[PDB]
Swiss-Prot record:
Feature type site, description Participates in a stacking interactions with the tyrosyl of cYY: 165, 179
Annotated catalysed reactions: cyclo(L-tyrosyl-L-tyrosyl) + 2 reduced [2Fe-2S]-[ferredoxin] + O2 + 2 H(+) = mycoclysin + 2 oxidized [2Fe-2S]-[ferredoxin] + 2 H2O
Keyword terms of this UniProt record: Cytoplasm, Heme, Iron, Metal-binding, Monooxygenase, Oxidoreductase
Names of the cofactor(s): heme
Pfam family, one: p450
Subcellular location: Cytoplasm
Record PROSITE patterns: CYTOCHROME_P450 (PS00086)
Gene: cyp121
Gene3D superfamilies in alphabetical order: Cytochrome P450
InterPro entries, sorted: Cyt_P450 (IPR001128), Cyt_P450_B (IPR002397), Cyt_P450_CS (IPR017972), Cyt_P450_sf (IPR036396)
Function: Catalyzes C-C bond formation between the carbons ortho to the phenolic hydroxyl of cyclo(L-tyr-L-tyr) (cYY) producing mycocyclosin. Can also use cyclo(L-Tyr-L-Phe) (cYF), cyclo(L-Tyr-L-Trp) (cYW) and cyclo(L-Tyr-L-3,4-dihydroxyphenylalanine) (cY-DOPA) as substrate.
Protein name, per record: Mycocyclosin synthase
């Protein structure tokens, strides 16, 4: 037999039995990625946290020429160090502040947009596609608002994402075409006097501030493209798969409909059980480091399997059950951990909370319109998502 291949399954509605078997018997295990490279797959909560909390397991170094790769780059190699570049430019605080969900009127905008999307689906009649006509447009509209760019520019930027977030063995020519075009768009935004709000409005001001005069225009444009793309793909994909998990749990759906104050705790559990990340998080060892029974050597690739940690019964007893009263509810790894913890975690929570609150009010009887096995799971992609999510109500 050949070496165990990753990823195990593109399905986002069930965890393969193999994960629990590996976690119990071999919580760090050698695997082969789609490029042919070997890697260490880490699948227990304890070892996943160890890797993510030790910066000697480096994100930046995964982009080095000649390294064992999980997948091909879809961005320039320096962009793998995006957050380090933002920090070096003195822009970290400003970027973080721009992407919080607490800007005046943002939550009301999210609620209004979700309600409008849902009203259009109700008018059109069942079946409705909750990914393409709800979750993704809601994510796109949210990120246009947060960036300060026109809502009407959302769809074309969104169209890049089915390629930008591919998990491919080989470089993708279309990724460069779209990247270069989206960079040109964001560079134009920085020069557009109408853009005075949100992240791009703030970056546009800082760009002309003497304390930032040697920050490159390339970096300012890259922040726009990367935060739009990572935010939209991550929130749209998470909400989509969370809606599946909610629909498949009518008792919980009814509880959250009846007691909406429990939605934040429900979203935290939906984050914990979420299978949206299709691959382990990659890191390259910069030293020889003991992880469990394995001495990982300098230059080797490690893959941190988020659902390995998040379904680990030693940390989350009865891991497959959504329980709203856990004592460690935010200790999951859905947003990562350590140096590269998601900078948009609060916005991602609020997007899902508001989307779910709106859906349960407008469509309390929501259910799948097709048997669950009929969902078509996107392959060779950095997220697990159904191509369509047909529902009735
Ligand atoms: C529920 C929605 C989201 C989930 C589940 C999610 C998940 C994650 C995870 C697991 C990481 C860590 C990757 C790693 O360590 O290798 C990450 C990083 C990142 N996230 Fe999020 N996220 C979400 C929402 C957002 C939003 C709304 C934004 C921005 C608007 C965003 C922007 C980013 C960026 C830029 C990084 C890279 C941080 C870095 O390189 O250091 N994410 N996200
Ligand atoms: C979430 C996440 C996430 C983070 C990273 C780490 C890192 N940091 C970054 O900011 C961007 C995100 C990105 C990738 C492709 C695009 O077209 C646009 C943005 N690239 C990076 O390599 C990688 C993949 C992700 O999925």
């Amino acid at each position: 037999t050949v070496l165990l291949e990753v990823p195990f399954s593109a399905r986002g509605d069930r965890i393969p039995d193999a994960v629990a078997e590996l976690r119990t018997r071999e919580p760090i295990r050698k695997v082969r990625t789609i490029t042919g490279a070997e890697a260490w797959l880490v699948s227990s909560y304890a070892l996943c946290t160890q890797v993510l909390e030790d910066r000697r397991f480096s994100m930046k170094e995964t982009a080095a020429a000649g390294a064992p790769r999980l997948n091909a780059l879809t961005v320039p190699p320096e962009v793998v160090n995006n957050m380090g570049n933002i920090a070096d430019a003195g822009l970290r605080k400003a970027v973080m502040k721009a992407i919080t969900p607490k800007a005046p009127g943002l939550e009301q905008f999210l609620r209004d947009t979700a309600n409008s999307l849902l009203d259009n689906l109700i008018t059109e009649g069942a079946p409705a596609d909750l990914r393409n006509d709800f979750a993704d447009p809601l994510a796109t509209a949210l990120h246009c608002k947060v960036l300060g760019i026109p809502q009407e520019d959302g769809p074309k930027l969104f169209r890049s994402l089915s390629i930008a977030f591919m998990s491919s063995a080989d470089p993708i020519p279309a990724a460069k075409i779209n990247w270069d075009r989206d960079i040109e768009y964001m560079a134009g935004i920085l020069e557009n006097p109408n853009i005075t709000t949100g992240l791009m409005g703030e970056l546009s001001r800082l760009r002309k501030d003497p304390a930032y005069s040697h920050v490159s225009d390339e970096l300012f444009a890259t922040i726009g493209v990367t935060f739009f793309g990572a935010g939209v793909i991550s929130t749209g994909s998470f909400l989509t798969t969370a809606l599946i998990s909610l629909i498949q749990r009518p008792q919980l759906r009814n509880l959250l409909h009846e007691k909406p104050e429990l939605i934040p705790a429900g979203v935290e559990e939906l984050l914990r059980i979420n299978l949206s990340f299709a691959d382990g998080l990659p890191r390259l060892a910069t030293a020889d480091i003991q992880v469990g029974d394995v001495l990982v050597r300098k230059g080797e690739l490690v893959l941190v399997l988020l659902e390995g940690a998040n379904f680990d019964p030693e940390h989350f007893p009865n891991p497959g059950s959504i329980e709203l009263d856990r004592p460690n509810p935010t200790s999951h790894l859905a947003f990562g951990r350590g140096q590269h913890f998601c900078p948009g975690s609060a916005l991602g929570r609020r997007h899902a909370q508001i989307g779910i609150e709106a859906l349960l009010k407008k469509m309390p009887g929501v259910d799948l319109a097709v048997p669950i096995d009929q969902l078509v799971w996107r392959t060779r992609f950095q997220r697990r998502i159904p191509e369509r999510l047909p529902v009735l109500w």
